[PDB]
Amino acid sequence: MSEKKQPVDEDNWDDDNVEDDFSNQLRAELEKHGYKMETS
Amino acid sequence: MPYFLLTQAVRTGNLAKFNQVLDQFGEKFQADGTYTLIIRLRHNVIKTGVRMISLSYSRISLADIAQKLQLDSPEDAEFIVAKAIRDGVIEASINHEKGYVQSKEMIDIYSTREPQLAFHQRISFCLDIHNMSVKAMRFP
Amino acid sequence: AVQKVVVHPLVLLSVVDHFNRIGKVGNQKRVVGVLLGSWQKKVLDVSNSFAVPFDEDDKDDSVWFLDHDYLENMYGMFKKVNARERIVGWYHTGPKLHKNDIAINELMKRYCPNSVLVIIDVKPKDLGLPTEAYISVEEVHDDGTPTSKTFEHVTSEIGAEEAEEVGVEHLLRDIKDTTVGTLSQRITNQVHGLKGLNSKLLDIRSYLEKVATGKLPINHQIIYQLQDVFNLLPDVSLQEFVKAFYLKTNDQMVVVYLASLIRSVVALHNLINNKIANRDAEKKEG
Amino acid sequence: YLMEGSYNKVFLAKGNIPAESYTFFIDILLDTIRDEIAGCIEKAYEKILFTEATRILFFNTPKKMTDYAKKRGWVLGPNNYYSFASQQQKPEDTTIPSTELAKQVIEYARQLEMIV
Amino acid sequence: TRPANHRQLTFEEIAKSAKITVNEVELLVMKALSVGLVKGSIDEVDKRVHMTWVQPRVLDLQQIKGMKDRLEFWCTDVKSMEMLVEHQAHDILT
């Protein structure tokens, strides 16, 4: 404005929530998905 | 950035993930004076985990649920659910013999009550848009 | 047989104004005239009418007499000026018929095969749609008693064609017309509960009164049967009426959404075009 | 521990407090927790075994559980307990909410007439 | 006779009143279905009997008193709720 308080101090986002779920969980993932095969 | 990692670990159901962020990133929260939430948010993390597990599992064992949420003991497994029922978090009925926890899915009341409560805000807001448009329209 | 009747305001007025004729000379009783109807289908229609002098002695309280020659001449004049019009029955202003009115129909039944009698009300009071319509039939009875003639109710409605709507709507100059979509449905919404209540309340006071006084019969037969029919419906959930809830609300779902859909469009055209026509038109003037 | 809630974790922390002078306060904290055992156990649990509830009430065979057999009521069964009947009061609610369902629409239509 | 409805019956009730075998209660009730005094459908999986409608016959003095009480019960209720409907709609009419 700049008056008063402030001088004192589809889209891809909806799916980017789920991507954030993929970031902290199960990586992507390829390698682990391929490593779980020979474990048992 | 530190704050964003905070909410990132908050929406998750892992409790240890949440306790790490306060340790590493608390130094920034000191400056904001935002520690007032960090004590009371734990209640919301445990309530989130139990909500997930409630809808995502038909029947869950109270002893086996503690390992995933690092609940650590059998006794608090009854406590979280006790207050969950007390606050209306989960409608499941629990039997203590072993014990076990079973859950049921009830509906059909549903769109009776919830949409009309929203409509009360929707329509009132739309007629307010009409009043605010008439007000600025009558000036000429 | 006959289902419903249609009575125009013109002929109705023709009863009322004759009530002003005999009003000044008085005295007792009620206006009695012969009705002129028009029959184009099973639905009945009335256009005009003609009054007839009638007097009821009191001694002789069941004595009734009409003018037949005058009836012939006046109906002949109306048949002369209008070939379509003919007598469908008779009429009186009531307000409530008397037991003697059963034979009055039997007289003129030589003129018309089925003569429908129409009560009217000259002084509007209660309880709703005016006048009345009765048809003369014989339902016998399950008792085997000699045949009793009781008049049966025929639903009446006020109507018109073209020119008769003109004067009627023109002379009022009182209340808004109609107006459909806003004040036509809500006012009648309260009319539904109000006219439902007072009808039910006067008649339900009658039901409690009939067993104390008015016996016999009264009750029986017609009373108890319809009584159980009234006890046929409680009428609510359980069960499925519970399930009509969310689909009624769900019928409101799309309606609220369409509402809010066009509400923003109204604000769109109005605010956009007006704010432009406000500041951009004022800046050129000053 | 009160968002957990506790109950038991607080009972482990209530043994060791420096404190000081918190004795007079932790007795009040005691009673105000113990009635919450009774309030928060049901609704809603199907049943709980005898000695299992005796593990939370502590003592040995207290008269507090007899006073709870009065206050709750609720049920007292042999070597067990019951939430009957049933879970409780069985809300439907059938035609009771249809009154306010009509009532809400009354003033809702009024808001439609205020536009008009 | 039952205040009901709650109009659903049971095979044991007809088996006790009619003192007949369960296999004959079929033609029993179905005869009345053909006559038309009652339209109630029969549950033959649980042998239960579900009555519908009713056949009114005569009346009793006690039944007239119960009648006018249950009857006026209707007018008081509908008048009280109707006046609420006009209560909220009174100020917007004038």
Topology at a glance:
The structure is cut from a larger assembly and holds chains A (40 residues), B (140 residues), C (286 residues), D (116 residues) and E (94 residues).
Chain A: H1 12-23, H2 31-39
Chain B: H1 2-11, H2 15-32, H3 35-56, E1 59-60, H4 62-65, H5 75-86, E2 93-95, E3 100-102, H6 113-137
Antiparallel strand pairs in B: 1-3, 2-3
Helix pairs in contact in B: 1-2, 2-3
Chain D: H1 8-13, H2 23-41, H3 50-57, H4 64-71, H5 96-113
Task: Provide an overview of this structure.
The structure is cut from a larger assembly and holds chains A (40 residues), B (140 residues), C (286 residues), D (116 residues) and E (94 residues). Chain A is an all-alpha fold and 40 residues long. Chain A has helices at residues 12-23, 31-39. With 140 residues, chain B is mostly helical. Chain B contains six helices and three strands. In chain B, a hairpin with a 4-residue loop joins β2 and β3 (100-102). With 286 residues, chain C is α/β, with parallel strands linked by helices. Chain C folds into two domains: 2-182, no CATH class; 223-282, no CATH class. Chain C contains seven helices and eight strands. A six-stranded mixed beta sheet of chain C has the order 5-4-2-3-1-8. Chain C has a two-stranded antiparallel sheet with strand order 6-7. The radius of gyration of chain C is 28 Å and the shape is extended. By secondary structure, chain D is mainly α. Chain D is built from five helices and no strands. The interface between B and D is medium-sized, with 26 and 28 residues. The PDB classes it as hydrolase. Keywords: ubiquitin-proteasome system, AAA-ATPase, hydrolase. The entry is titled "Structural basis for dynamic regulation of the human 26S proteasome". Chain A: 26S proteasome complex subunit DSS1. Organism of A: Homo sapiens.
